[PDB]
């Protein structure tokens, strides 16, 4: 928004907004350049975005064209899990039923991750990610 993009620099529109506003994937919070640079420059600490406590790491930033945090997280996790599963049980022979069932399972996993449920099934999905990565290494 034009009124919130940094807890210290929330209204820089009349100060010539020439600085970008980075967002850490472990916070999903907007921080302007001159602030975040000092943040990870003085040490990996948390940002004070409305009392945020999640630690902001050095570098590992991203540019955002803004498609809501829900869809951005669903496409990041969607691409990551899509790379973990790779082309396993997909285009191996040409079947349509088992392929659509496996895609239904993957989309149900992404659904359980974007909903969180009760922080119990998502951990099993993480173990599934470690198992799929172990299968891709072999």
């Amino acid at each position: 928004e034009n009124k919130d993009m940094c807890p210290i620099c929330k209204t820089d529109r009349y100060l010539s907004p020439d600085v970008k506003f980075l967002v850490n994937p472990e916070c999903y919070h907007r921080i302007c350049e001159s602030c975040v640079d000092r943040i990870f420059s003085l040490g990996p600490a948390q940002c004070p975005y409305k009392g945020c406590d999640k630690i902001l790491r050095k570098n590992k930033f991203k540019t955002q064209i803004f498609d809501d945090v829900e869809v951005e997280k669903e496409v990041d996790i969607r691409k990551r899990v899509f790379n973990v599963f790779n082309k396993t049980i997909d285009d191996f022979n040409g079947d349509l039923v088992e392929y659509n069932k496996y895609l239904e399972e993957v989309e149900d996993i992404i659904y359980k991750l974007d909903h969180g449920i009760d922080v119990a099934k998502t951990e099993e999905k993480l173990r599934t990610y470690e198992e799929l990565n172990k299968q891709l290494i072999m």
């Binding site: 064209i65 498609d67 809501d68 829900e70 869809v71 669903e74 496409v75 969607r78 691409k79 899509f82 349509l96 039923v97 392929y99 659509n100 069932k101 895609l103 239904e104 989309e107 659904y111 974007d114």
Partner: protein
């Protein structure tokens, strides 16, 4: 008459041999020929073989075809005294063929079909687990209603009054009577409609004769079948629609999730084919013409439910907002746009099958549907179906930024029109194509490729009753050049032209109709004209078609024209050839005896659409920079020439400015080129010769 009899023989031989014919009929004397030729051609074979599929461009031609068809019924019932199985079914507008919106709604909008779906859903819901039925229902599918038409003609107005008396609804009568294979009189926007042509194509059951009446705007109708402008507000309606879909997801996931799982199993087991094969009398959504699409085995989002469809739909509309927020000038290739979309997020080329199914699923799970959100979802759904399929000739274009606020627009450019018309040449044969505003008739074998025969008009007699002069010298020959630019130049010269219109209108005060290439000249001469004696002496009042035309305003202007000409007053009708209402009702002195044309017709250039279709037709037929400034203008001028011709018993005069008219043909090619001041005295003599030769030639 022998002249029309020749066209009767041509229609006969083309119906008995050819599969399609390009017949050029004279304006004003060729409407009643095919109507009887088709019926007699059906009687000579055996009474019920092929049926009349008459297609017009307006509703006035539909009403004229209905009353002339009634003249055929009376004509065949007054000469033999034997009653036969009558035909004639009037398929008109939904708002004009319904009775309930005139009792409680009091509206004539395009949402009457939604209320009709509310009543139909009320009937289905009172026949299943339980609004009222409607006004009268449950008796519209019986044999008596199926026989009220073959025993007596009840089409349109007679059907409206007959339903108002017999307490019936005409919508289900017409819909149930499309399968009866009567004489259907519908427009071109129904034969090629990505929502209506499917059901009509499934009810007529093919095997008939199609009649393309006034087939000169076929390319315009095929163009109007696509091109939807995305103007930043559809993004907000798509956002609120996605939020409404999320709320509906919370509602169906809150308490009642069994029906969504059962219908989901119906999708996994029987797919879209079973979903559309089980539902009866349910509201449908848009589709890129399934008979032309030919895509079966529609999988429901790789076997997924609704939350994934609204998630990928939110990602899709957000990607659309991302593609609509760019610099200014940018053109898209529909394949490169789909590849870029795949680079942003994988969704494959199957969102078409994912829209046609999920929309029906949501419909099957919705009982209180919001109209704007569902409409926006249908728009995004159509955009998905047309970025997933149909790519040859299709060209996605982004409107440039010109202020940059009023700007984020995205329009899709349609494909080759031959593709859209194609199915009628497999469904049918002996399709007669008649038009009175086609000259030359070679741009239809060229553009739109199809094998056919060419028959030109062979009727031309009594040239003294059809005064056809043209004006070249306007006294200074300076307004004919300044009246050809897109933006007018030298306002004083335009004021002089308007003064020439005042002198010409004063010379011939007997009903004047003026056609303009655009409304810019009208709005420039109507602001401050320095003269008004024509309105104060001979015309009493002037008739101006608004640049934003209104139905009631145009109707009051036409009725005002008929009453003004029926009181011995007359009025100038400042209209645009490119505007609405092309007219076609004449055969009387109430219409303009003299018609004035401001130069030649012009199409708006400097547009991305004209350049896209320009290069497309350049690659197709290589008719670059030559036919788009003479063929379209020739049709637009012929629309004004057709109003002057109204039978040999009547006369008229049409003044065409600009010498460039000599570069194009015209109906009845008998034209003399002279000045306008001389044309004043020439018309002054014609207004007496036309009145003297009548009783002499009779």
């Amino acid at each position: 008459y022998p002249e029309q009899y020749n066209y009767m023989c041509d229609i006969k031989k083309t119906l008995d041999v050819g599969g399609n014919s390009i017949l050029e009929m004279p304006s004003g004397t060729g409407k009643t020929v095919s109507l009887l030729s088709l019926t007699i051609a059906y009687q000579m074979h055996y009474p019920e073989h092929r049926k009349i599929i008459y297609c017009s461009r307006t509703m006035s031609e539909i009403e004229k075809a209905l009353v002339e068809l009634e003249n055929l019924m009376d004509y065949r019932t007054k000469e033999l005294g034997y009653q036969e199985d009558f035909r004639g079914l009037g398929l008109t507008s939904r708002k004009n063929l319904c009775l309930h919106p005139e009792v409680s709604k009091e509206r004539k909008g395009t949402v009457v079909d939604e209320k009709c779906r509310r009543m139909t859903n009320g009937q289905a819901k009172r026949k299943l687990e339980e609004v009222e039925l409607c006004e009268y229902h449950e008796n519209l599918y019986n044999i008596e209603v199926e026989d009220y038409l073959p025993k007596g003609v009840f089409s349109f107005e007679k059907l409206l009054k007959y339903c108002e008396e017999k307490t019936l609804c005409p919508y289900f009568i017409v819909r149930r009577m499309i399968s009866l294979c009567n004489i259907i009189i519908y427009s071109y926007h129904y034969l090629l409609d990505p929502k209506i042509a499917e059901r009509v194509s499934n009810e007529v059951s093919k095997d008939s004769i199609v009649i393309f009446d006034e087939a000169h705007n076929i390319d315009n109708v095929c163009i109007e079948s696509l091109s939807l402008d995305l103007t930043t507000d559809a993004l907000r309606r798509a956002t609120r629609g996605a939020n409404a879909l999320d709320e509906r997801i919370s509602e169906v996931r809150k308490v009642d999730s069994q029906k969504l799982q059962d219908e989901y199993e119906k999708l996994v087991q029987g797919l879209x084919x079973x979903x559309x094969x089980x539902x009866x009398x349910x509201x449908x959504x848009x589709x890129x013409x399934x008979x032309x699409x030919x895509x079966x085995x529609x999988x429901x989002x790789x076997x997924x439910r609704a939350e994934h469809f609204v998630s990928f739909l939110k990602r899709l509309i957000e990607y659309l907002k991302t593609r609509m927020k760019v610099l200014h000038v940018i053109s898209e290739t529909p394949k490169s746009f789909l590849q870029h979309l795949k680079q942003l997020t994988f969704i494959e080329r199957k969102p078409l099958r994912f829209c046609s199914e999920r929309l029906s699923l949501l419909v099957r799970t919705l009982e209180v549907t919001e109209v704007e959100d569902f409409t926006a979802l249908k728009d995004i759904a159509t955009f998905a179906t047309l970025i997933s399929t149909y790519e040859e000739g299709f060209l996605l274009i982004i409107e440039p930024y010109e202020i940059a606020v009023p700007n984020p627009i995205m329009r899709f450019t349609c494909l080759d029109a031959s593709i859209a018309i194609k199915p009628v040449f497999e469904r049918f044969s002996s399709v007669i194509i008649t038009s009175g505003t086609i000259s030359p008739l070679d741009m239809y074998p060229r553009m739109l490729n199809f094998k056919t025969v060419l028959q030109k008009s062979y009727a031309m007699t009594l040239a003294k009753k059809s005064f056809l002069p043209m004006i070249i010298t306007k006294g200074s020959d300076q307004v004919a050049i300044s009246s050809r630019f897109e933006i007018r130049n030298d306002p004083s010269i335009v004021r002089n032209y308007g003064s020439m219109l005042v002198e010409f209108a004063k010379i011939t005060p007997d009903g004047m109709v003026v056609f303009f290439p655009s409304y810019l000249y009208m709005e420039s001469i109507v602001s401050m004209w320095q003269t008004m004696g024509i309105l104060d002496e001979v015309w009493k009042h002037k008739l101006i078609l608004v640049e934003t035309p209104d139905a009631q305003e145009t109707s009051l202007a036409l009725e005002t024209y008929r009453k003004a000409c029926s009181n011995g007053r007359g009025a100038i009708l400042l209209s645009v050839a490119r505007g609405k209402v092309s007219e076609g009702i004449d055969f009387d002195h109430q219409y303009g005896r003299t018609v004035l044309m401001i130069g030649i017709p012009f199409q708006y250039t400097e547009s991305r659409i004209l350049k896209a279709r320009l290069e497309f037709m350049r690659e197709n037929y290589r008719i670059r920079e030559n036919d788009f400034l003479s063929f379209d203008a020739m049709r637009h001028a012929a629309q004004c020439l057709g109003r002057v011709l109204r039978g040999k018993d009547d006369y008229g005069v049409m003044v065409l400015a600009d010498r460039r008219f000599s570069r194009k043909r015209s109906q009845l090619p008998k034209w003399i080129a002279q000045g306008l001041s001389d044309a004043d005295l020439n018309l002054s003599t014609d207004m007496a010769i036309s009145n003297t030769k009548q009783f002499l030639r009779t």
